[PDB]
C-alpha cells in the first residue's frame, strides 16, 4: 500500500520478544479448551458460552475439519482464527494436488507454523492471537499437536489452553493417563472442561469432536447432550 | 495499561487488548440510530428510523435500507461513509459469487467474506478499521429466514433477534424479555414487536413517516421495503 | 520602567512564545560567531599570557565551526595548558592548533554538539 | 496529544480528528448555495473582490463535469479542481462504456467513494473540498446532491456551503420548491446572496450564477449575467 | 508514518550495532549445545527444554535437524525461526546437489546461510534472525568439521564450542580438559556427559534431559547415528562410576 | 526531532539542502579565475601525513578534452557526478557530432542535483567548479548542492571562501592575462593554507583554445612557485 | 519495499553514519602493511585467538585474484560481502580486457560500491576499512586503503584499527630509505612495527607477503619467531 | 508545532502549514512584474547576483513560440516544471498540429503540482510562475502558487517586497489597457523601481524584459537591447 514494511516486533533490552509475550497474554484471555489423545483417536473439546439467550449456536462452529480426517480448534480470538483456518484449507490442497495423497498432520503443523512464524516478522502486522490444537489419524497412530503465536509447535499427550490452563494442566497431569478408550477420553475431557465452567453445561455450551482412525466425525448435540448427562 | 504506540495503531497492549477495535465498537455511537432485526417463523423484519433535521433534506435518499441482491437485504448503522463503502463490496462479492459459482449466494457466506475483509482491515497496521456495523437478512433452502450481524472486528455472527447501535444495550435486554416465552411468531406479531421493542426504548410513539421497515417472507422471497400506507396500517394496528 | 529582560535556552514553549509578541519585542537569534568574527574572541585572548607575532587567528578560526567563544577559549587554554606540560613559555600558532584539531574532533566523538536536535 | 496527527487513528471518544479538521477547513471559505425547482437546478456562488485582484471570470468555482452535470465548489480550491478532473474522467468512462448519459446517483457514488477512499490511509490526507451537483434529464428529473469532505453524499432540495452557511440556509425554507419556475428562482437566489455576507467584512464582491434544467434543454451553462440582469435590479431594491 | 518506525538497522551513538547485541542476548537464553574434538566421529549435545511428562516424543529428534546425507545442525533460541533457516538451508544444499551432482561442502553452505542473516542485518528495517546454530558433517577435502553461527553472520570453525550462555563455563571446562586427537568415542562421550553433568545445574544428569547425536564416517554410508536412551543410561552410570572413582583422591 | 527528509523550514527552504551547504565549509579550498585567454584553476590537496603518497589524490579530473573540472567537500560524492557527467557529454557527441557546450553540462547535472526522497536519499554534498572553452569563449562555472547554477568570473569555495573572495575582488580586473593570474592564485593559496607551500601541496589546471592540451604535469609547478 | 532515508545530513554539516560508523573501524583488529620496492608485506594483529581452537576460518587476509591481496579492519561480517562482490567484479574484468586487474580499478570498485551503499534508501553503511595491495602488471607495487566514505587513498604504509595514531605515528620513525633496502628488513620491519602494537607474543601476529610474481604466501609460525629473535637480539645490540 | 511536520497533517485551525512555508519560499525570491494591455503582454523581472564578479542569475526563460514564464523562488524545480512545460507544449504541437492556448496549459500545472501536495513524503514546488502568451482571444497574465491556485489577473507581482509594486499598479490599472509597448514597458518597470530601496539604481545590467505579441514572437532582452528601453525615465522623488 505504501511499502512501509518495517517490523514493529523488535527485541527488548533483555532480549524478549514483546509482541509474542503480549499475544500469549491475549491467548490467556481466551476461552478454555482441552484435547486428549487416547489409543485409538483424539478427542478435542471446546467451551462455547453464548453471551445471551438471544444467540444461535447452530451458526458458528468451533471444531472445524480440515480434511476428512483432520480437526482443528483454538483458544484465542476467532477473527484471527478463521484466516489461518482458510489458509490451512487452501494449504492442504496443494499437497493433495501434487502428491495425490491425504496430507499428514505432521506436515500441516510444519507448514502452518511456517506461515505463522514467517508472519511474525513481515511488514507491519501484529501476530495472530490464536493457539491451535490440531488432531488427526494418519498411518495408524493418531496425533495431537499444538501451535502458538510464537510459531512453535509441540506434541502433547493431553493438553489444555485458554483460561485456567495450569488448573486443567495439573488436572490432566494425574487424571489423564497411560491409555483409555475413545469414550473414556470424552469423560475426562468433559470433566476438565467442567473444571472452569458456569453452573450448567448443556449441548449448547460444549462442542466436542473426535477423530476415528477410519475418519473424522464432528459430533452432534444429540450425543453431546447424551454424554454430559452423566455430569462428565 | 499502555506501552509504546498501542494507543494509536492496532498492536497489542500488555494486558492482551488492542484499543483500536474497542474504539471502533463506539465508533457506531455517533450515528444516533436504533435498528432491530427479528426472525419470525417464515419471515424476518428489519426496522430502522431516520432523522430529518431539515425540511430541505429528502426522504428518498437517507434510507439506510440497502438492497444487496434480489434475495438479500441489509441495513446499516455506524458512520455513513464506512457503511456505504461496505455496501459496494457486498454487492460486488455477491455478483462474483453469481459469476463464479452459478447459483445464488447464501446469506451465511457473504458475512464470512465481509468479516474476512474487515479482518484484513484490522490485521494490517496502517489502515483504518472501518467503524460501521453490518446487519443482514435473507432466505435459505429449508433453513427459513436468517439474520446476521457483522461488527467491525471481523466475525460473522447471527442470531434469533439481534440489535446493535446506540441504544441497543437496553434493547437486547428487552428482547431477552420478549423472546424467551411460549409465544410463536406470526407476521404481524413480528412487525408489532419490531415497533414496540423500539417504542419501549425511545418512548415517543410517533408518526409512520419515521421508521423504515424492510421485510422478507417466504411467499415471495424478494427483499421488499414497505410503503408508508401499510406501515401506518401496522402502526395503528398495534394500537388497541 | 526598566522594560525587564528575558533569557533562556530553547524557544520552547509555544504558549509563552506566542504571548510575548503581544507585549514584548526584540527577539534576536544568536549569533554565535561570524567567520570573520572568531578572531575578535582571539583579540581579547591575544592579551593572555605571551602571544607570538607569527600567530594568525584567521587560520584557526575556520577549523573550529560553531565554537562561539567558549570552545575557542579552550584554544588559548590548551595553548598554555600544553605549554607548561612541555615546560615551554609561549605558544606558537602551529603549537596549539595541532591540539585544536584534536579538541574539536576528539570531543565530537561522543557528541558533535549540535543544537538542531534540541528543538528537533 | 498524538490522536489528531494521523488520519488512520481513532480518538478515545470515538471520532476521527483529521476528518473533523477537514470539515471546518471548508468553514472558512465563502458562501455558495444551491436550490432546485420543479424543472431545473439553480446555482449561485458569491465571489470575493477586495481591490484589484483578478480579471472578471478568473478561477470560477462553477465547473462543468458532464454535458448535464456541474459543480459548485467551496473550500480549498486545488483539490476541488482535482475532483473536477476525476469526476470528469468518471463521466468519460460511463459515457464510453455503457452508451448513455451518466445518472447523478452513480456519479455521486463513484466520486464519494474516492473522497472516502482518501480517509483510510496515512498515505494521503482527507480532502478539504465540498461541492454541489446539479442535473436534469427528462427521464430523471432534477436532482441535487451534496458531498462533504467526509464522504457522505445525499440529497437536498437546497443547500449552502461557506462561512455564512446557517444564515444563508435559514431563508431557503421561505421559498417554495414545488410550484416555482427556475426563471424566478434565479433572482430568488440573488436576493439573499446579496443579503447574506454583509459588506462590513469584505468591501466588495461579485456574483456567479449557473443554471441547468428544462429551459436550457439538458445542457448546463452559465447564464449570461448581463442578460436580463435580474440580480442587482432586485437587490438594490431589497435593502429596505 | 515514519514516527511509528522502530529503526532496527541504524548504528547507535556509542560504537556498536544496537540490535545485534539484543539479538545475542536472546541466544543467551534457553539453549545448550556443544560438540567435541573427535576423530572417526563427531558428536552433538542437546538439553531438553520441555522435560514434562506430557509430551509425545514422536518427532524422533528434538534439537537435531538432519539436512543432508552427511550434515546436521543444532537449533538454539527461537525455534521456529530456525524452522525457517533449515528449510532455506536444506534447499540451498539440495540445489547445490542439483547443479553439480556432488555433495555440498560445509563452508559455502555456512556462508550461503550467513549472507541471508547478514542480509537482514544490513538493510530492511527488519527484525533480525535470532538463532545461533551449530554445524557438523563430513566432506571430501577436510574430513570432519564444526562451525558456529551468529545473528551478525560471522562464522567460526571450532573443535569444541559454546551454546549458549551457560556454555561459557563449558568453554572453561573444555580448555581445562583439553586434548589433541583422542576419539576413542567413549572418551569423547565421557567428556561430553561430564561437561553436561557439571555445567547443567540439575544433579545426576537424568537420562531424559540430555540428547546425543553422533556421526561416524562409513564408506559409503556416512551414518548420522542418533542414539537412544538405552545406550545413554549405561554411559551415565559409567560417568558416575568415574566420579566415584576420581573422588577417592581426597 | 528527525522529521520529513523533504520538509520546508519556517523561513523557509529545504532543511536538508541548508544543512548540505554547511558541509562545503569544512572541505578544502579552491580558486577559479576566468581569463580572456583561457581558464586557470587552483586547489589544495591537504596532505594529512607523510605516510600518504601525494599525487594519487584527485581534485581536478578533466571531463572532456575541452571541459575541466574542480571538486570539493566529500570527494566520493563528487566521483559519481563526474562519471555520469562524462556520459552526458559523450551522449551529446554521439547524437550530435559536436562538442557539448560548457553551459549545458551543468544543466545536465543540476537537473538531478535534487532527486532525493523515498519513492520516485540525501542530497549531494559537493560544490563543483566547471571550466572549459566552448565556442562562446572560456567559461568558468559553479554549481552547488541546491542546483542553483550561475556563471562566476572568479569564484572561491570552501573554508577559505570568505577571505579568498574578499581578498580576490581587490586583485582582479577585466583584462587579466594567464601567467598573471597563475601567480595571482598562489599568493592567495599560500595565505590560506596551513602547510608550507611546495611541490606536493597544490595543483594548477589550465585550458585554452590555443594552449591545449596543456594539461597538468609536475616540474611546471616548480617553476611556478619559484617565481614568488 | 523499504523506502526510508537512513543516512541524512546533520545540521553541523556531517553525515552521521559515515563519520560515526568509523568507530566500528576503531574497535576492530589492527592491521598494518608496508610496500617494499620488490616484495610487499601486510599483516593482521590483535587476533585475540582462543589458542586451542581452529584458525583457518578466522583467516582475514584473502585474495580476489592472485594479483591482489586483501586486508581489513572492523567487523568481518560486512566485509565478507564486499570481498565476494569484489571478486565477482574482478572476474568479469578478466572476461573483458585481457590484462589482469589493476589494483586502482578494484579500489575504485569497492569505493564506488560503498559510496552508493551509503547513498541509497534503507541501507546501513558499511563499517569497514580495508587495504588492497598488489604488485600489478608491469611489476610495479602499490597500495590503497578504503574508507566507509568510499575514498580510496594511496599510502606508502598502513595503520588501521585500534591505535592507528600509534602505529601511524611510529612509521614516521620507520620511513628512512634504508628501510627497506632488503626484503628481510621489510618483513622484520613490519613485525618490529607490530611490537608497538598489541601484545606481540608471537601468537596473534599473522603476516603474509607477495613476491611480485608469486601467489601470496601465508607464512607459518617458523620465521616469525626468528624475526622476533633477530629483533630482540637487535634490541640487545641497541645498548 | 508537532503538526508542522508533514504535508499530510491538517491543522486544528484548518491551514496546512507546508503550503504556508512554501509561500514563504515564494516571497524570498526577487521581484518581478507582469502586466498586460489588450493587445500585448509584458513581464519584467529583476535579477540579483551573489557577488560583484558573479553574473546575475537570470529569471525569464523562453518556453514556447508564444508562452513565456517568469520565476521566483527555487531554481531546480523551475527547471522541473520548465521541462514538463516544454513537453506538454510539444505534445499537443506534435499531435493536433496547432499551438496550445494558455488557459488549458495551466490546469496541467495545477494537476501536476497537486499530487506532490497530498501524498506522504512529497514536498510542494517552490515556484513563482508568471505565465504569459497568446491564445486566439488575446493576452493572458496568470500566476501560480505552491498550493496550485492559479489566478487570471490583469497585473500581479510576486517576490520580495512586491506589495509596493501592487500599490503602484492599482492607481494605474485604469490606464494600463489602451497604450502600446514603449510606454507599457516603462509602466512595467516603474513597479520594479518601487520594489527597490530609493538610494541605489535601477541599473542596466540587471533588468530583463519579456514581451509577447501578435506580430511579435516571445523575446527576452538582456541589458543591451534593454538599454534602449531604460533611457528617458523620471527621477525618483526626494
**DSSP letters of A47-86?**
E---SSTT--SSS--SSEESSSS-EEEEEE-HHHHHHHHH
Residues D124, H111: C-beta atoms closer than 8 Å = no
Is A90 part of the contact surface with chain D (CB cutoff 8 Å)?
no
Domain covering F1-228, topology: 3.60.20
Mapped onto helix, strand or coil, the DSSP state of residue E128 is coil
Name chain C contacts of G14, Cβ cutoff 8 Å: 112
Q: Grid coordinates in use for D233?
A: 435590479
Beta carbons of H205 and H223 less than 8 angstroms apart: yes
Q: Grid coordinates in use for C89?
A: 613559555
Q: Of A198, A177, A199, which Cα lies nearest the Cα of A189?
A: A177
Cα separation values, H166 from F62, H34, H130, H163, Å: 50, 11, 15, 5
Q: Grid coordinates in use for C92?
A: 606558537
> Which CATH number is A1-232 given?
3.60.20.10
Task: Find the residue in A nearest to D122 (Cα).
Answer: A2
Cα separation values, H93 from H65, H99, H102, Å: 11, 6, 13
Name chain B contacts of A53, Cβ cutoff 8 Å: 176, 179-180
Instruction: Report the alpha-carbon distance of residue H11 to residue D223 in Å, rounded.
Output: 38
Residues F3, C97: C-beta atoms closer than 8 Å = no
| Counted domains in chain D | 1
Name chain D contacts of E1, Cβ cutoff 8 Å: 6, 122-123
Residues F11, H28: C-beta atoms closer than 8 Å = yes
Q: Grid coordinates in use for A107?
A: 506436515
Name every residue whose Cβ is closer than 8 Å to that of residue E157 and which is 6 or more positions away in sequence.
Answer: E145, E146, E147, E148, G53, G54, G56, G57
Residues A118, E57: C-beta atoms closer than 8 Å = no
Q: Grid coordinates in use for C8?
A: 533562556
Is B128 part of the contact surface with chain E (CB cutoff 8 Å)?
no
Count the neighbouring beta carbons within 10 Å of the beta carbon of residue A70: 23
Cα separation values, E47 from E150, E161, E195, E202, G153, Å: 20, 15, 12, 11, 52
Total residues found in chain C within this entry: 120
Instruction: Report the alpha-carbon distance of residue D110 to residue D95 in Å, rounded.
Output: 14
Name every residue whose Cβ is closer than 8 Å to that of residue G157 and which is 6 or more positions away in sequence.
Answer: F51, G32, G33, G34, G35, G171, G174, G175
Count the neighbouring beta carbons within 10 Å of the beta carbon of residue D121: 21
Mapped onto helix, strand or coil, the DSSP state of residue B198 is helix
Rg (CA), chain D: 18
Task: Spell out the alpha helix ranges (H) of chain G.
Answer: 16-20, 23-26, 76-95, 103-119, 164-170, 183-193, 224-237
Q: Grid coordinates in use for B197?
A: 421493542
Q: Strand order of the sheet with strand F141-143?
A: F69-70, F128-130, F141-143, F150-151
Q: Of the candidates F22, F80, F122, which has its C-beta nearest G5's C-beta?
A: F122
Contact residues of D toward H, CB < 8 A: 1, 4-7, 17-18, 21-22, 24-25, 27-28, 51-55, 57-59, 76-79, 81-82, 85, 118, 122-126, 128
The CATH number that applies at residue D207 is 3.60.20.10
DSSP H or E stretch at residue H140: strand H138-143
Q: Do chains C and D touch (3 or more CB pairs under 8 A)?
A: no
Q: Grid coordinates in use for F224?
A: 611556478
Instruction: Report the alpha-carbon distance of residue H75 to residue D30 in Å, rounded.
Output: 35
Instruction: Report the alpha-carbon distance of residue F45 to residue F42 in Å, rounded.
Output: 10
b/e for E112-138, b at 16 or more Cβ within 10 A?
A: bbbebbbebbbbbbbbbbbbbbbbbbb
CATH 3.60.20.10 is right for the domain spanning E1-250 = yes
| Counted domains in chain H | 1
Contact residues of H toward D, CB < 8 A: 2-3, 5, 7-12, 14-16, 107, 110-111, 114, 117-120, 147-155, 166, 169-170, 173
DSSP code of H117?
G
The CATH number that applies at residue H136 is 3.60.20.10
Using CB atoms, list chains with 3+ pairs below 8 Å to chain B.
Answer: A, D, E
**Kindly report the CA angle at F196 between F190 and F199, in degrees rounded to 5?**
90
List residues bridging with A46 in a β-sheet: A33, A207
Task: Spell out the alpha helix ranges (H) of chain D.
Answer: 17-23, 78-98, 104-117, 182-195, 230-235
D104: left (phi over 0), alpha (psi -120 to 50) or beta: alpha
Residue A11 has φ and ψ, to the nearest 5°, of -90, 155
Most E CBs within 10 Å, among G17, G25, G77, to test the E interface:
G77
A100: left (phi over 0), alpha (psi -120 to 50) or beta: left
Alpha carbon of H54: minimum distance to chain F alpha carbons (Å): 4
Name chain E contacts of A151, Cβ cutoff 8 Å: 80-81, 83
Beta carbons of G85 and G113 less than 8 angstroms apart: yes
Q: Of B55, B48, B56, which Cα lies nearest the Cα of B83?
A: B48
The reply to whether omega before F12 is within 30° of 0 (cis) is yes
Q: Of D68, D132, D127, D130, which Cα lies nearest the Cα of D94?
A: D68
Task: Find the residue in B nearest to D153 (Cα).
Answer: B81
DSSP code of C91?
B
Beta carbons of D235 and D191 less than 8 angstroms apart: yes
Task: Spell out the alpha helix ranges (H) of chain A.
Answer: 18-28, 78-98, 105-119, 165-174, 182-193, 221-227
The approach used to solve this structure was: cryo-EM
Q: Of the candidates E13, E155, E160, which has its C-beta nearest G20's C-beta?
A: E13
Beta carbons of B216 and B73 less than 8 angstroms apart: yes
Q: Of F36, F13, F41, which Cα lies nearest the Cα of F175?
A: F36
Mapped onto helix, strand or coil, the DSSP state of residue D74 is strand
Amino acid at each position: 500500500e505504501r511499502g512501509y514494511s518495517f517490523s514493529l516486533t523488535t527485541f527488548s533490552p533483555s532480549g524478549k520478544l514483546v509482541q509474542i509475550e503480549y499475544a500469549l497474554a491475549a491467548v490467556a484471555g481466551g476461552a478454555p479448551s482441552v484435547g486428549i489423545k487416547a489409543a485409538n483417536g483424539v478427542v478435542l473439546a471446546t467451551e462455547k458460552k453464548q453471551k445471551s439467550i438471544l444467540y444461535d449456536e447452530r451458526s458458528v462452529h468451533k471444531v472445524e475439519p480440515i480434511t476428512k480426517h483432520i480437526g482443528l480448534v483454538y483458544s484465542g480470538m476467532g477473527p484471527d482464527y478463521r484466516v489461518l483456518v482458510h489458509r490451512a484449507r487452501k494449504l492442504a490442497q496443494q499437497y493433495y494436488l501434487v502428491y495425490q495423497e491425504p496430507i499428514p498432520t505432521a506436515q500441516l503443523v510444519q507448514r502452518v507454523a511456517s506461515v505463522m512464524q514467517e508472519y511474525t516478522q513481515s511488514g507491519g502486522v501484529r501476530p495472530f492471537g490464536v493457539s491451535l490444537l490440531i488432531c488427526g489419524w494418519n498411518e495408524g497412530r493418531p496425533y495431537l499437536f499444538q501451535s502458538d503465536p510464537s510459531g512453535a509447535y509441540f506434541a502433547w499427550k493431553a493438553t489444555a489452553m485458554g483460561k485456567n490452563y495450569v488448573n486443567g494442566k495439573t488436572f490432566l497431569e494425574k487424571r489423564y493417563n497411560e491409555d483409555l478408550e475413545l469414550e473414556d477420553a470424552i469423560h475426562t475431557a468433559i470433566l476438565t472442561l467442567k473444571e472452569s465452567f458456569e453452573g450448567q453445561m448443556t449441548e449448547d455450551n460444549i462442542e466436542v469432536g473426535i477423530c476415528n482412525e477410519a475418519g473424522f466425525r464432528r459430533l452432534t448435540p444429540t450425543e453431546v447432550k447424551d454424554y454430559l448427562a452423566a455430569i462428565a | 495499561s499502555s506501552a509504546g504506540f498501542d494507543r494509536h495503531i492496532t498492536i497489542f497492549s500488555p494486558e492482551g487488548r488492542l484499543y483500536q477495535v474497542e474504539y471502533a465498537f463506539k465508533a457506531i455511537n455517533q450515528g444516533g440510530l436504533t435498528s432491530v432485526a427479528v426472525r419470525g417463523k417464515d419471515c424476518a423484519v428489519i426496522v430502522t428510523q431516520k432523522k430529518v433535521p431539515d425540511k430541505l433534506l429528502d426522504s428518498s435518499t437517507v434510507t439506510h435500507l440497502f438492497k444487496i441482491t434480489e434475495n438479500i437485504g441489509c441495513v446499516m448503522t455506524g458512520m455513513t461513509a464506512d457503511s456505504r463503502s461496505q455496501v459496494q463490496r457486498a454487492r460486488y462479492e455477491a455478483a462474483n459469487w453469481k459469476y463464479k459459482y452459478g447459483y445464488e449466494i447464501p446469506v451465511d457466506m457473504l458475512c464470512k467474506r465481509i468479516a474476512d475483509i474487515s479482518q484484513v482491515y484490522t490485521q494490517n497496521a496502517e489502515m483504518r478499521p472501518l467503524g460501521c456495523c453490518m446487519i443482514l437478512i435473507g432466505i435459505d433452502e429449508e433453513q427459513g429466514p436468517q439474520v446476521y450481524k457483522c461488527d467491525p472486528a471481523g466475525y460473522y455472527c447471527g442470531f434469533k433477534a439481534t440489535a446493535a447501535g446506540v441504544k441497543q444495550t437496553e434493547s437486547t435486554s428487552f428482547l431477552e424479555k420478549k423472546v424467551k416465552k411460549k409465544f410463536d411468531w406470526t407476521f404481524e406479531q413480528t412487525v408489532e414487536t419490531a415497533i414496540t421493542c423500539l417504542s419501549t426504548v425511545l418512548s415517543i410513539d410517533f408518526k409512520p413517516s419515521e421508521i423504515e421497515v424492510g421485510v422478507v417472507t417466504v411467499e415471495n422471497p424478494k427483499f421488499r421495503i414497505l410503503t408508508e400506507a401499510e406501515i401506518d396500517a401496522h402502526l395503528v394496528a398495534l394500537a388497541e | 520602567n526598566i522594560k525587564v529582560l528575558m533569557a533562556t535556552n530553547r524557544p520552547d514553549t509555544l504558549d509563552p512564545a506566542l504571548m510575548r509578541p503581544g507585549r514584548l519585542d526584540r527577539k534576536i537569534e544568536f549569533s554565535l560567531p561570524d567567520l570573520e568574527g572568531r578572531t575578535h574572541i582571539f583579540k581579547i585572548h591575544a592579551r593572555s599570557m605571551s602571544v607570538e607575532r607569527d600567530i594568525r587567528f584567521e587560520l584557526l578560526a575556520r577549523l573550529c565551526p560553531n565554537s562561539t567563544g567558549a570552545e575557542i577559549r579552550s584554544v588559548c587554554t590548551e595553548a598554555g595548558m600544553f605549554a607548561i606540560r612541555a615546560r615551554r613559555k609561549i605558544a606558537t600558532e602551529k603549537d596549539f592548533l595541532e591540539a585544536v584539531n584534536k579538541v574539536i574532533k576528539s570531543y565530537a566523538k561522543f557528541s558533535a554538539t549540535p543544537r538542531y536536535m534540541t528543538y528537533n | 496529544t498524538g490522536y489528531d496527527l494521523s488520519a488512520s487513528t481513532f480518538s478515545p471518544d470515538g471520532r476521527v480528528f483529521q476528518v473533523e479538521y477537514a470539515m471546518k477547513a471548508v468553514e472558512n471559505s465563502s458562501t455558495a448555495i444551491g436550490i432546485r425547482c420543479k424543472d431545473g437546478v439553480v446555482f449561485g456562488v458569491e465571489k470575493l473582490v477586495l481591490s484589484k485582484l483578478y480579471e472578471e471570470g478568473s478561477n470560477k468555482r462553477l465547473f462543468n463535469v458532464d454535458r448535464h452535470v456541474g459543480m459548485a465548489v467551496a473550500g480549498l480550491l486545488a483539490d476541488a479542481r482535482s475532483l473536477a478532473d476525476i469526476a470528469r474522467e468518471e463521466a468519460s468512462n460511463f459515457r464510453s462504456n455503457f452508451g448513455y448519459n451518466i445518472p447523478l446517483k452513480h456519479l455521486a457514488d463513484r466520486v464519494a467513494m474516492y473522497v472516502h477512499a482518501y480517509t483510510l490511509y496515512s498515505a494521503v490526507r482527507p480532502f478539504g473540498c465540498s461541492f454541489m451537483l446539479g442535473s436534469y434529464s427528462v427521464n430523471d428529473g432534477a436532482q441535487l446532491y451534496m458531498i462533504d469532505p467526509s464522504g457522505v453524499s445525499y440529497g437536498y432540495w437546497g443547500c449552502a456551503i461557506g462561512k455564512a452557511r446557517q444564515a444563508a440556509k435559514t431563508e431557503i425554507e421561505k421559498l417554495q420548491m414545488k410550484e416555482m419556475t427556475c426563471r424566478d428562482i434565479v433572482k430568488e437566489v440573488a436576493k439573499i446572496i446579496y443579503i447574506v455576507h454583509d459588506e462590513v467584512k469584505d468591501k466588495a464582491f461579485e456574483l456567479e450564477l449557473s443554471w441547468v434544467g428544462e429551459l436550457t434543454n439538458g445542457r448546463h451553462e452559465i447564464v449570461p449575467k448581463d442578460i436580463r440582469e435580474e440580480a442587482e435590479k432586485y437587490a438594490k431594491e431589497s435593502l429596505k | 508514518s515514519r514516527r511509528y518506525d522502530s529503526r532496527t538497522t541504524i548504528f547507535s551513538p556509542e560504537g556498536r550495532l544496537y540490535q545485534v547485541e539484543y539479538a545475542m542476548e536472546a541466544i543467551g537464553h534457553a539453549g545448550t549445545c556443544l560438540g567435541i574434538l573427535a576423530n572417526d566421529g563427531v558428536l552433538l549435545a542437546a538439553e531438553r527444554r520441555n522435560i514434562h511428562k506430557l509430551l509425545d516424543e514422536v518427532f524422533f529428534s528434538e534439537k537435531i535437524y538432519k539436512l543432508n546425507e552427511d550434515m546436521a545442525c543444532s537449533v538454539a533460541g527461537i525455534t521456529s525461526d530456525a524452522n525457517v533457516l533449515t528449510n532455506e538451508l536444506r534447499l540451498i544444499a539440495q540445489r547445490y546437489l542439483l547443479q553439480y551432482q556432488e555433495p555440498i561442502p560445509c563452508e559455502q553452505l555456512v556462508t550461503a546461510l550467513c549472507d541471508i542473516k547478514q542480509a537482514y542485518t544490513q538493510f530492511g528495517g527488519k527484525r533480525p534472525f535470532g538463532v545461533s546454530l551449530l554445524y557438523i558433517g563430513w566432506d571430501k577435502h577436510y574430513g570432519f568439521q564444526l562451525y558456529q553461527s551468529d545473528p551478525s553472520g560471522n562464522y567460526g570453525g571450532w573443535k569444541a564450542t559454546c551454546i549458549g550462555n551457560n556454555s561459557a563455563a563449558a568453554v572453561s571446562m573444555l580448555k581445562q580438559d583439553y586434548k589433541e586427537g583422542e576419539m576413542t568415542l567413549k572418551s569423547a562421550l565421557a567428556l561430553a556427559i561430564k561437561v553436561l553433568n557439571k555445567t547443567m545445574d540439575v544433579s545426576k544428569l537424568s537420562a531424559e534431559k540430555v540428547e546425543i547425536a553422533t556421526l561416524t564416517r562409513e564408506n559409503g554410508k556416512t551414518v548420522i547415528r542418533v542414539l537412544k536412551q538405552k545406550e545413554v543410561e549405561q554411559l551415565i552410570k559409567k560417568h558416575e562410576e568415574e566420579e566415584a572413582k576420581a573422588e577417592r583422591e581426597k | 526531532y528527525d522529521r520529513g527528509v523533504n520538509t520546508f523550514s519556517p523561513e523557509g527552504r529545504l532543511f536538508q539542502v541548508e544543512y548540505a551547504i554547511e558541509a562545503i565549509k569544512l572541505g578544502s579550498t579552491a580558486i577559479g579565475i576566468q581569463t580572456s585567454e583561457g581558464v586557470c584553476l587552483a586547489v589544495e590537496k591537504r596532505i594529512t601525513s607523510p605516510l600518504m603518497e601525494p599525487s594519487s589524490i584527485e581534485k581536478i579530473v578533466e571531463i572532456d578534452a575541452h571541459i575541466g573540472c574542480a571538486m570539493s567537500g566529500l570527494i566520493a560524492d563528487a566521483k559519481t557526478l563526474i562519471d555520469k557527467a562524462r556520459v552526458e557529454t559523450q551522449n551529446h557527441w554521439f547524437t550530435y557530432n559536436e562538442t557539448m557546450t560548457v553551459e549545458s553540462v551543468t544543466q545536465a547535472v543540476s537537473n538531478l542535483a535534487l532527486q532525493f526522497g523515498e519513492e520516485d536519499s540525501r542530497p549531494f554534498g559537493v560544490a563543483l567548479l566547471f571550466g572549459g572553452v566552448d565556442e562562446k569563449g572560456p567559461q568558468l562555472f559553479h554549481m552547488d548542492p541546491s542546483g542553483t547554477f550561475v556563471q562566476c568570473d572568479a569564484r572561491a569555495i570552501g573554508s577559505a571562501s570568505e577571505g579568498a573572495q574578499s581578498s580576490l575582488q581587490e586583485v582582479y580586473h577585466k583584462s587579466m592575462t594567464l601567467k598573471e593570474a597563475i601567480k595571482s592564485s598562489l599568493i592567495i593559496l599560500k595565505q590560506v593554507m596551513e602547510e608550507k607551500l611546495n611541490a606536493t601541496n597544490i595543483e594548477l589546471a589550465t585550458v585554452q583554445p590555443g594552449q591545449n592540451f596543456h594539461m597538468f604535469t609536475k616540474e611546471e609547478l616548480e617553476e611556478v612557485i619559484k617565481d614568488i | 519495499s523499504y523506502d526510508r532515508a537512513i543516512t541524512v545530513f546533520s545540521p553541523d554539516g556531517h553525515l552521521f553514519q559515515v563519520e560515526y560508523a568509523q568507530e566500528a573501524v576503531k574497535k576492530g583488529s589492527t592491521a598494518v602493511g608496508v610496500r617494499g620496492r620488490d616484495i610487499v608485506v601486510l599483516g593482521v594483529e590483535k587476533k585475540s585467538v582462543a589458542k586451542l581452537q581452529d584458525e583457518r576460518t578466522v583467516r582475514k587476509i584473502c585474495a580476489l585474484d592472485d594479483n591482489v591481496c586483501m586486508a581489513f579492519a572492523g567487523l568481518t561480517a560486512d566485509a565478507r560481502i564486499v570481498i565476494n562482490r569484489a571478486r565477482v567484479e574482478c572476474q568479469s574484468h578478466r572476461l573483458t580486457v585481457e590484462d589482469p586487474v589493476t589494483v586502482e580499478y578494484i579500489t575504485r570498485y569497492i569505493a564506488s560500491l560503498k559510496q552508493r551503499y551509503t547513498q541509497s534508501n534503507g541501507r546501513r553503511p558499511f563499517g569497514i576499512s580495508a587495504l588492497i595491495v598488489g604488485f600489478d602488471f608491469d611489476g610495479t607495487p602499490r597500495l590503497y586503503q578504503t574508507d566507509p566514505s568510499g575514498t580510496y587513498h594511496a599510502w606508502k604504509a598502513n595503520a588501521i584499527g585500534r591505535g592507528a595514531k600509534s602505529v601511524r605515528e611510529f612509521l614516521e620513525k620507520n620511513y628512512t630509505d634504508e628501510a627497506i633496502e632488503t626484503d628481510d628488513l621489510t618483513i622484520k620491519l613490519v613485525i618490529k612495527a607490530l611490537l608497538e602494537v598489541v601484545q606481540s607474543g608471537g601468537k596473534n601476529i599473522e603476516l603474509a607477503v607477495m613476491r611480485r610474481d608469486q601467489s601470496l604466501k601465508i607464512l607459518n609460525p617458523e620465521e616469525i619467531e626468528k624475526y622476533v629473535a633477530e629483533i630482540e637480539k637487535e634490541k640487545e645490540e641497541n645498548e | 508545532n508537532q503538526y508542522d511536520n508533514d504535508v499530510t497533517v491538517w491543522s486544528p485551525q484548518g491551514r496546512i502549514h507546508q503550503i504556508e512555508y512554501a509561500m514563504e519560499a515564494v516571497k524570498q525570491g526577487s521581484a518581478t512584474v507582469g502586466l498586460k494591455s489588450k493587445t500585448h503582454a509584458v513581464l519584467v523581472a529583476l535579477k540579483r547576483a551573489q557577488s560583484e564578479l558573479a553574473a546575475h542569475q537570470k529569471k525569464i526563460l523562453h518556453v514556447d513560440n508564444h508562452i513565456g514564464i517568469s520565476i521566483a523562488g527555487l531554481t531546480a524545480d523551475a527547471r522541473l516544471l520548465c521541462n514538463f512545460m516544454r513537453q506538454e507544449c510539444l505534445d499537443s504541437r506534435f499531435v493536433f498540429d496547432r499551438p496550445l492556448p494558455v488557459s488549458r496549459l495551466v490546469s496541467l500545472i495545477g494537476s501536476k503540482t497537486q499530487i506532490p501536495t497530498q501524498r506522504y513524503g512529497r514536498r510542494p514546488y517552490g515556484v513563482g510562475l508568471l505565465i504569459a502568451g497568446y491564445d486566439d482571444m488575446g493576452p493572458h497574465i496568470f500566476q501560480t502558487c505552491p498550493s496550485a491556485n492559479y489566478f487570471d489577473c490583469r497585473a500581479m507581482s510576486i517576490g520580495a517586497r512586491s506589495q509596493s509594486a501592487r500599490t503602484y499598479l492599482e492607481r494605474h490599472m485604469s490606464e494600463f489597457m489602451e497604450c502600446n509597448l514603449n510606454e507599457l514597458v516603462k509602466h512595467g518597470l516603474r513597479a520594479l523601481r518601487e520594489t527597490l530601496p530609493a538610494e541605489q539604481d535601477l541599473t542596466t545590467k540587471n533588468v530583463s524584459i519579456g514581451i509577447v505579441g501578435k506580430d511579435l514572437e516571445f523575446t527576452i532582452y538582456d541589458d543591451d537591447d534593454v538599454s534602449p528601453f531604460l533611457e528617458g525615465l523620471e527621477e525618483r522623488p526626494q
